[PDB]
Amino acid sequence: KRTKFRKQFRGRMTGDAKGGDYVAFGDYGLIAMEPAWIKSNQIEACRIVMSRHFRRGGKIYIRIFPDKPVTKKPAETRMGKGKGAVEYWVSVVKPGRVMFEVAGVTEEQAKEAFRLAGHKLPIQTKMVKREVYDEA
Amino acid sequence: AAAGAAPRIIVKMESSAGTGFYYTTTKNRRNTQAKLELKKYDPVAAHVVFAAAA
Amino acid sequence: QLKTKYNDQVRPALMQQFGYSSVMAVPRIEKIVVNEGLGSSKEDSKAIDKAAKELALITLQKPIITKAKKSISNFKLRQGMPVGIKVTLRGERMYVFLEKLINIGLPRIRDFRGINPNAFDGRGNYNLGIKEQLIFPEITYDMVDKTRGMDITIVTTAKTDEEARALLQSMGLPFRK
Amino acid sequence: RRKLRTRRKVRTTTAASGKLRLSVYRSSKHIYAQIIDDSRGQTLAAASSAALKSGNKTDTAAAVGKALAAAAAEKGIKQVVFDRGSYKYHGRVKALADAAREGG
Amino acid sequence: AHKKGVGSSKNGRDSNPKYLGVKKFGGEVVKAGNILVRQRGTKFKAGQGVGMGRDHTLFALSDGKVVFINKGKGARFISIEAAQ
RNA sequence: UCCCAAAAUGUAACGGAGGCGCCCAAAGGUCACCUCAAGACGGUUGGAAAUCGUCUGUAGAGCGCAAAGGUAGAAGGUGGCUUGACUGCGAGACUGACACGUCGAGCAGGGAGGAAACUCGGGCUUAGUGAACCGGUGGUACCGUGUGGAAGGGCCAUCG
RNA sequence: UCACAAGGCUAAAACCUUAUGAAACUCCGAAGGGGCACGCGUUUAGUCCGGGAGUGAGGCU
Numbered sequence: 001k002r003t004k005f006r007k008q009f010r011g012r013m014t015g016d017a018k019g020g021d022y023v024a025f026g027d028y029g030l031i032a033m034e035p036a037w038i039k040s041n042q043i044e045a046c047r048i049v050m051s052r053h054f055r056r057g058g059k060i061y062i063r064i065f066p067d068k069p070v071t072k073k074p075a076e077t078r079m080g081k082g083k084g085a086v087e088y089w090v091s092v093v094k095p096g097r098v099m100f101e102v103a104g105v106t107e108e109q110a111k112e113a114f115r116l117a118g119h120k121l122p123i124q125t126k127m128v129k130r131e132v133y134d135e136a
Numbered sequence: 137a138a139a140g141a142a143p144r145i146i147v148k149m150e151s152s153a154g155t156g157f158y159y160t161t162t163k164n165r166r167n168t169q170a171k172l173e174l175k176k177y178d179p180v181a182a183h184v185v186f187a188a189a190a
Numbered sequence: 191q192l193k194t195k196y197n198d199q200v201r202p203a204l205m206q207q208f209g210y211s212s213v214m215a216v217p218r219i220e221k222i223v224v225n226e227g228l229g230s231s232k233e234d235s236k237a238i239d240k241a242a243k244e245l246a247l248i249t250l251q252k253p254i255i256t257k258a259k260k261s262i263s264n265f266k267l268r269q270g271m272p273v274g275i276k277v278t279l280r281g282e283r284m285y286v287f288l289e290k291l292i293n294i295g296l297p298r299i300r301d302f303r304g305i306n307p308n309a310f311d312g313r314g315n316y317n318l319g320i321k322e323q324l325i326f327p328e329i330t331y332d333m334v335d336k337t338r339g340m341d342i343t344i345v346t347t348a349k350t351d352e353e354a355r356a357l358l359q360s361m362g363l364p365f366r367k
Numbered sequence: 368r369r370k371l372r373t374r375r376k377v378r379t380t381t382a383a384s385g386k387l388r389l390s391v392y393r394s395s396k397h398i399y400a401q402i403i404d405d406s407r408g409q410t411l412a413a414a415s416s417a418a419l420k421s422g423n424k425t426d427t428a429a430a431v432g433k434a435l436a437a438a439a440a441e442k443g444i445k446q447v448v449f450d451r452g453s454y455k456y457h458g459r460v461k462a463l464a465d466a467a468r469e470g471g
Numbered sequence: 472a473h474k475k476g477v478g479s480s481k482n483g484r485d486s487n488p489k490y491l492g493v494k495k496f497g498g499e500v501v502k503a504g505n506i507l508v509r510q511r512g513t514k515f516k517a518g519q520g521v522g523m524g525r526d527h528t529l530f531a532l533s534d535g536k537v538v539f540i541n542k543g544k545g546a547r548f549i550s551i552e553a554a555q
Numbered sequence: 556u557c558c559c560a561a562a563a564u565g566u567a568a569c570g571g572a573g574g575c576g577c578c579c580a581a582a583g584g585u586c587a588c589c590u591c592a593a594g595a596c597g598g599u600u601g602g603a604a605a606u607c608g609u610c611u612g613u614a615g616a617g618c619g620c621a622a623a624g625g626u627a628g629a630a631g632g633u634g635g636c637u638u639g640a641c642u643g644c645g646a647g648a649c650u651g652a653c654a655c656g657u658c659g660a661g662c663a664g665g666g667a668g669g670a671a672a673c674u675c676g677g678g679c680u681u682a683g684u685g686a687a688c689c690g691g692u693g694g695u696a697c698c699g700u701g702u703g704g705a706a707g708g709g710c711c712a713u714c715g
Numbered sequence: 716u717c718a719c720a721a722g723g724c725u726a727a728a729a730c731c732u733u734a735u736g737a738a739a740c741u742c743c744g745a746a747g748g749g750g751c752a753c754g755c756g757u758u759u760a761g762u763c764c765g766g767g768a769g770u771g772a773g774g775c776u
């Protein structure tokens with residue numbers, strides 16, 4: 001969800017995903033395909049979906065994290081007078097970046113918990129499975 | 137600068153030489169307390185030390 | 191003085207004890223360092239005067255007022271003000287004051303049975319600070335006001351703690367077993 | 368501790384000064400007082416004190432000042448800069464000085 | 472229906488530009504007292520023939536030709552070497 | 556002062572943050588000397604932090620204030636002597652539409668510190684500012700309405 | 716420096732492996748740009764002195 005202390009406001013720009021395209025901490029992984037912004041609550045949503053479907057307990061790695069403050073001006077104001085005041089928080093997930101890692105669950109379980117998380121997501125995704133030893 | 141001027145004041149350093157010449161700078165009154173005693177050039181002779189006139 | 195010669199008779203004692211390939215490669219004694227860190231709560235000019243007096247009368251050497259490192263935590267601290275008092279003794283007066291100590295100090299210590307033998311400067315040296323002041327050759331309660339205590343730090347040029355230890359003891363020193 | 372020497376060393380503006388700098392080394396009971404044209408990596412004159420010393424250990428400073436300055440006459444050196452070391456210009460190295468400071 | 476403000480900015484402010492950097496570059500002729508760098512600090516240290524005002528301004532002392540010495544990062548010098 | 560500002564300078568917004576309208580007679584000149592933060596072991600008040608010691612230790616500190624650059628061969632901490640926080644100038648550049656503004660070698664008088672090479676025309680630097688006009692004050696003897704004076708102006712300094 | 720994902724470890728901090736975000740972070744760091752010299756090679760502009768201006772609401776990709 002939120003960061004704890006910071007600077008306040010920000011900006012916007014894009015190209016392909018820095019690190020990391022590879023599958024650590026787990027056996028199955030879910031990957032972006034589109035240059036989105038991702039809000040806390042959207043992740044929160046995926047977290048709760050997958051957490052329920054796994055029941056107790058599995059193991060869930062939420063790689064992505066919202067450090068980026070997005071603002072929205074008040075209702076019905078003429079432009080200017082200031083910058084909008086922190087509406088919510090996004091995490092700038094670029095394509096190929098791995099958003100999710102789950103392990104301690106079968107392939108089937110992983111597929112499903114993934115698909116369920118996917119339908120809650122602003123962007124297309126793909127699941128995959130290890131071999132990406134660029135390092136470890 | 138401005139009137140109230142409690143710390144630092146524009147003081148004028150007038151010569152002992154009796155020439156006419158003087159200088160100007162600033163003293164804190166926190167640390168000069170009494171007077172100011174300085175040794176600068178005089179252009180109506182050569183180098184004769186002044187005191188802090190009002 | 192005499193103590194110097196006794197060191198020079200500890201030297202083949204530790205040469206023989208340790209089998210040193212050299213006589214300078216043997217533990218010696220560098221300075222003695224006397225600290226008196228009253229301050230913080232004792233902000234009295236009168237008191238640092240008294241510590242000056244006491245120190246000058248026992249150590250026969252003027253003491254330095256080691257100020258506050260300007261660290262000002264929540265409680266009572268500040269910038270540049272007296273908080274401690276240092277007197278560094280090395281060489282002659284070191285040996286004089288140290289002999290004064292083994293001679294008249296720890297003996298005249300109220301309830302004394304030795305000091306802590308568990309390791310000190312694991313680099314190879316040894317400190318040991320000592321409490322009370324009403325246990326002295328020169329200090330009197332019939333020449334002071336209140337009651338204080340101090341800090342003491344020697345520098346054995348040893349290489350470990352067993353060698354430091356050895357030097358200390360055979361120099362004449364109480365290890366509470 | 369090497370701070371004093373590299374201090375005065377850089378403080379002697381090496382080349383752009385023009386003048387030649389003049390080393391010392393009185394830490395041991397032997398010195399070395401070299402005369403250097405800084406810029407060129409070459410050492411011009413010099414006058415040691417470990418090839419016979421008469422006997423004096425620090426009293427001989429004036430001697431090697433006079434001896435050096437003597438070498439300086441011949442080589443043709445009239446300008447100088449005093450590269451001291453960690454040496455606080457007082458007695459010995461002051462002797463070497465005054466000595467060279469007249470006997471040039 | 473409508474709104475009534477009220478907020479503003481505390482910001483805006485900035486300071487008039489400080490035309491800094493080097494004015495005289497590698498391989499450039501130089502008159503006496505021609506300036507070669509404006510800088511905040513010791514970014515560029517004076518070498519031979521160049522002095523340094525309090526602005527840490529580097530200005531050349533005796534005509535000649537400008538030469539840049541980069542002594543492996545954070546320690547750099549500018550100098551003049553006259554032609555011939 | 557930083558970011559925006561697109562690796563030269565420059566560049567707008569009721570774009571994003573933060574300081575200034577001073578301070579210092581030593582916090583300046585010079586001369587000489589000293590090296591930081593922090594952690595680990597052991598240490599009378601202590602015992603989170605005090606003061607001492609050992610080991611590590613390139614800056615993880617300090618620089619009167621904002622931040623950026625800068626800086627350990629010092630600008631950082633300490634001491635001696637001191638009044639260059641100086642007159643008469645200014646080769647040559649930076650910078651601005653103009654007015655401004657900034658840096659400055661070198662010459663003279665004449666001084667400061669140094670044994671000296673030397674350095675010093677304020678402060679590590681970048682904010683701490685107000686054009687003219689009319690007037691106050693110290694010097695100056697340029698003009699002074701028939702002439703000689705004096706009122707008054709002019710000049711350099713300087714205060715509002 | 717600020718922020719941050721799983722684990723170790725320890726009384727939490729530091730620290731260890733794994734892992735990542737940054738306009739106001741930077742061990743690094745392009746393409747490009749800017750100054751200067753030549754012209755080694757093409758082409759035509761330039762600069763200064765003086766007369767006359769107009770313009771100072773811009774618009775889109």
Ligand SMILES: [Mg+2]
Binds near residue numbers: 561
């Ligand atoms: Mg550009």
Ligand SMILES: [Mg+2]
């Ligand atoms: Mg514009």
Ligand SMILES: [Mg+2]
Binds near residue numbers: 688
């Ligand atoms: Mg008017």
Ligand SMILES: [Mg+2]
């Ligand atoms: Mg008048």
Ligand SMILES: [Mg+2]
């Ligand atoms: Mg008159």
Ligand SMILES: [Mg+2]
């Ligand atoms: Mg590398």
Ligand SMILES: [Mg+2]
Binds near residue numbers: 771
């Ligand atoms: Mg207009």
Ligand SMILES: [Mg+2]
């Ligand atoms: Mg317009």
Ligand SMILES: [Mg+2]
């Ligand atoms: Mg436009």
